[PDB]
């Protein structure tokens, strides 16, 4: 049953092992080409500090970079901008699906408007374009409550899903883990000073890069999919409508209905639903106790370039992974003409 | 470009479909009456 | 036997407990380029009351006005220097960042050794005999009654001790009698709670440990030395010589060492009256500051921190019950020459702590790194044609004692 | 809200950093290695004149 | 030069969500009423 | 009262934004610094000469 | 609480060190990139006295 | 690694010494294989070998 | 099989102060790593794991 919270906290942690292992040296790929078309001195990492001893002193090779491969990739982000898309509901054939498809995508407009949407489709489009793996957010903000789109960073350390899924869209998914970096000030802020802070170790990045800050904290967002028995209860109030099923959560008490337009009738039909939790979880502990959110579906939504589906493990790829070695070649080629041509002038 | 923005609107399809599920506990039920 | 990671295998590390607890408050951005080289700050003053049946007193002297101070003064450099062969150091040695992750800890810690030296050297009060280790639940508990005896109110009280002790206390509350949260952590964590014995209990490894210093005779005063406030009304040190030692020994009395004066008592500073331990009276203590030999004729001149002060023509600053004269008999704790860990417990107001920032050196690179609220000056040059490029680190800390008794070590008893 | 407004030419956040790009940036190598190629031409040519 | 134009307004965009923030305490609040 | 817009120069020096924001408009910030220089006539015009 | 104004000082000053210190390499590639593009002389910059 | 630090007034190291990086390496080393091997006829194969797995 | 130095004693390697477990100090040891032998006069030359720096 796993009644305490220790026992929930162990298997999360193998859950995300479990998780991590497969798509290791595939996110590794998409770093490396992120990296190499847009870091200044990214196209020669693996070989920053190289030379020879050249009488007794460590004189370095010269490493020229002469960025060619981001163009066409600059191209494709242009196309996309110029020209954006969004989501569109269409009618159906009834009396009055025209007004509910204006209604519906009326609403959507005014989320999508009043919050960072087109900001969360650039930067997932510019990530899926760049390395091949771009994601981002849809999450429920109390403003009374309003549905929010937010975008994801760095979705390639940060995203994880269970490995058990294979659609494009995820939606055979039980779990999902969610990572962002946190700063001491900002984690004393919430939570609590009182415990010490304890980060998730992933060993991903630092791969041909020069570490300085200290001062990032690594906590997650860890999502449930669980079928509960709920208990609904089916106010049959025949004025303005008899039929209507509510479930348990709104009660005669909890919400002043006071039975004014309801009449109790049956309320014993127990049902298995669909639910779904949402917990933010570190390398210790519980930072905030798992709590359900207003939905059916994992809320992440993944992008990507180009997927497949080779042996039990999903591919993915950008628009710099296949002209890494050319590139890296002529830039070695055009420092070893320089070298040489300044050796011997006249 | 053209496999990327097929990708992008085959991703928007799923945003979508999320969006529409999580609104009716949100949002409410939307029934059709005026008569 | 060629190729190597990049990644470097882990060490050890100690703990940080002195810089969180010690007051880091009053003394903050004091020492600037126009107060100086050193700080003061003021005292609290007293009053004493005449009883006469009809309110007359023209004969008696009214109170006398008495200001004191306590000084704040900077210490030396933490300074770490290092130089290297740029070709052999770069062979796989990138950006140089590998040497930066030992070098701040290694500041850090030198920093919290010395501020432990001071602390364990100010401080006054003792308890217990220094050979007894901490084994029960009386022995942490004596701490925070003293100090709520003497009445310090105004403050938080922490005390600190080894690894190994809390795991001593821990194995007590395992076997506790009703409380099933205590006992399923006792268990399970080996964590003893927050408050032990009514004083914030706390645990550390990295902890500063000390010599006795070999001693032996029965010792005794020779001279009445001087204990009026006005003599000590800045520092809170006084200095007296012995008779009765040894013939001539060098290092007689290390630093830190605890002299108690047998038939003085402490005083209830308020009401001034006798402090009582359940049994016995409790005798005035003070700790050796500096290094003391012995001289042919069985004479050691040292000087003391915390002072007895009966001072006749100003009763209400007395806080011993009767006034240091000669033929008094002290005695020295501990063993003659035995080293231990001692254990500290000291209130809020006790050592501050402040650093003074350090502004770059002309045309010479450098940058700042933190680590715990630590800023550390880093310079690199090029000093010398054989290619020898030197990295240097710099820290520069003060210190500052209140009060001398409040504050000191503690062991355990028998 | 506080009221500072930036602008970026090209921004990107690739590890726990912003990273942003100009136009300038990517000629830096081509172009101080043509100037000191047209310098190493000028003083050989003008060393040895018939 | 495109992205340089296309960041510029996204820009501007903030600019004036921040530009409206601000105008309702210096101006006041704006009301229909004219009936 | 008026509403007034100004310009910044030499942005690369002179802003600093709280490090844990991440958007583009920085809208999920909760402080920043802002830089200008300034002569020591001016120091005096403004502010106190005493200091 | 931070009753005091000296107190709230050293925690901007906190504050600033703890802004600046990651965003240091990268405003120093774009001013080095005006500077190369704008300065007459910007384009030999490092290796100006050499002989 | 591991440095020593030290403790002056002003900060004068000019005449002092200064640590140096003395450099060592833990080496790791591969074992013997291990390895189980069986063999069979052919004609127990066809007539004797059943349930194989 | 391990051996034990008795007047020597382990350190807090970060700090380099002594480790004392109440009123004992923790004494160094060590491990035999290969098999050692015995010849007359009584002298074992052993090879050990874990170094007294």
């Known amino acids: 049953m796993a009644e305490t919270l220790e026992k929930k906290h162990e298997r999360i942690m193998l859950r995300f092992d479990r998780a991590y292992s497969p798509q290791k040296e595939v996110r590794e790929k998409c770093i490396e080409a992120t990296r190499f078309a847009r870091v200044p001195g990214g196209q020669w990492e693996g070989a920053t500090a190289a030379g020879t001893k050249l009488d007794e002193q460590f004189e370095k090779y010269p490493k020229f970079e002469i960025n060619k491969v981001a163009t066409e990739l600059n191209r494709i982000i242009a196309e996309y901008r110029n020209n954006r898309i969004t989501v569109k509901f269409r009618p159906g054939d009834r009396e009055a699906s025209e007004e509910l498809a204006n209604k519906l995508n009326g609403l959507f407009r005014a989320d999508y408007e009043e919050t960072d949407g087109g900001e969360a489709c650039d930067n ?141 009738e049956v309320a014993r039909r127990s049902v298995k639903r669909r639910r779904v939790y949402v917990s933010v979880v570190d390398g210790d502990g519980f930072l905030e106790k798992p709590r359900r959110i207003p939905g059916e579906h994992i809320p992440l939504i993944p992008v990507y370039g180009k997927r497949w589906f080779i042996d039990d493990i999903e591919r993915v790829e950008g628009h710099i992974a296949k002209a890494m070695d050319p590139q890296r070649l002529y830039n070695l080629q055009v420092s070893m003409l320089a070298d040489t041509a300044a050796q011997d002038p006249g | 470009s053209f496999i990327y923005l097929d990708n992008m609107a085959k991703s928007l399809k799923r945003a979508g479909e999320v969006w529409l599920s999580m609104a009716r506990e949100v949002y409410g039920s939307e029934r059709e009456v005026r008569i | 036997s060629q190729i190597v990671l990049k990644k470097f295998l882990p060490g050890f590390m100690s703990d940080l407990v002195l810089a969180k607890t010690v007051d880091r408050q009053l003394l903050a951005g004091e020492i600037n380029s126009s107060t100086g080289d050193s700080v003061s700050f003021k005292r609290p003053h007293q009053f004493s009351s005449l009883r006469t049946p009809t309110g007359d007193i023209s004969g008696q002297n009214k109170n006398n006005l008495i200001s004191g101070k306590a000084t704040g003064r900077v210490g030396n450099y933490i300074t770490v220097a290092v130089e290297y062969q740029q070709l052999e150091e770069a062979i796989k040695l990138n950006q140089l960042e590998e040497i930066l992750a030992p070098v701040r800890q290694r500041i850090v810690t030198d920093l919290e050794t010395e501020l432990a030296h001071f602390m364990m050297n100010n401080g006054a009060l003792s308890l217990g005999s220094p050979n007894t280790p901490i084994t029960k639940w009386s022995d942490v508990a004596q701490t925070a009654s003293f100090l709520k005896d003497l009445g310090v109110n105004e403050g938080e009280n922490y005390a600190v001790m080894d690894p190994w002790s809390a795991q001593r206390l821990a194995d007590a509350q395992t076997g506790l009698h009703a409380s099933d949260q205590l006992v399923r952590t006792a268990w399970e964590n080996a964590q003893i709670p927050t408050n032990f014995g009514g004083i914030r209990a706390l645990m550390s490894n990295g902890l500063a440990s000390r010599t006795q210093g070999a001693f032996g005779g029965t010792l005794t005063v020779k001279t009445q030395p001087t204990v009026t406030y006005n003599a000590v009304k800045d520092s809170y040190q006084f200095t007296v010589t012995l008779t009765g030692a040894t013939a001539s020994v060098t290092g007689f009395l290390k630093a830190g060492d605890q002299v108690k004066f047998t038939n003085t008592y402490w005083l209830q500073q308020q009401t001034k009256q006798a402090l009582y331990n359940g049994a016995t009276p409790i005798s005035f203590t003070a700790t050796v500051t500096a290094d003391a030999n012995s001289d042919s004729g069985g004479d050691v001149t040292v000087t003391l921190s915390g002072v007895p002060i009966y001072d006749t023509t100003n009763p209400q600053y007395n806080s011993v019950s009767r006034q240091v004269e000669a033929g008094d008999a002290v005695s020295v704790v501990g063993t003659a020459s035995q080293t231990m860990k001692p254990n500290l417990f000291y209130n809020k107001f006790f050592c501050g702590l402040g650093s003074i920032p350090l502004p770059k050196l002309h045309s010479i690179d450098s940058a700042v790194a933190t680590y715990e609220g630590f800023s550390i000056r880093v310079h690199k040059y090029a000093d010398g044609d054989a290619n020898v490029q030197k990295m240097r680190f710099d820290l520069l800390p003060a210190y500052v004692c209140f009060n001398p008794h409040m504050g000191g070590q503690f062991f355990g008893n028998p």
């Not at chain 1, 609904?232 to 409508?241: A, E, F, K, L, Q």
């Open chain 1, 124 to 264: 997932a489009f510019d990530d899926a374009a760049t390395g091949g793996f771009g994601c981002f957010r849809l999450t429920s903000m109390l403003v009374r409550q309003r549905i929010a789109i937010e975008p994801i960073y760095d979705p390639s350390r940060s995203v994880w899903f269970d490995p058990d899924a294979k659609k494009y869209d995820k939606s055979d998914a039980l779990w999902a883990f969610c990572m962002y970096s946190l700063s001491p000030e900002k984690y004393e802020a919430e939570y609590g000073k009182k415990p010490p802070t304890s980060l998730d170790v992933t060993s991903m990045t630092s791969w041909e890069y020069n570490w300085f800050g200290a001062d990032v904290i690594y906590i997650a967002k860890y999502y449930e999919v669980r079928k509960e028995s709920v208990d609904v209860i089916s106010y049959r109030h025949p004025i303005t409508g008899e039929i209507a099923t509510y479930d348990s959560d709104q009660v005669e008490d909890i919400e002043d209905e006071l039975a004014i337009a309801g009449f109790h």
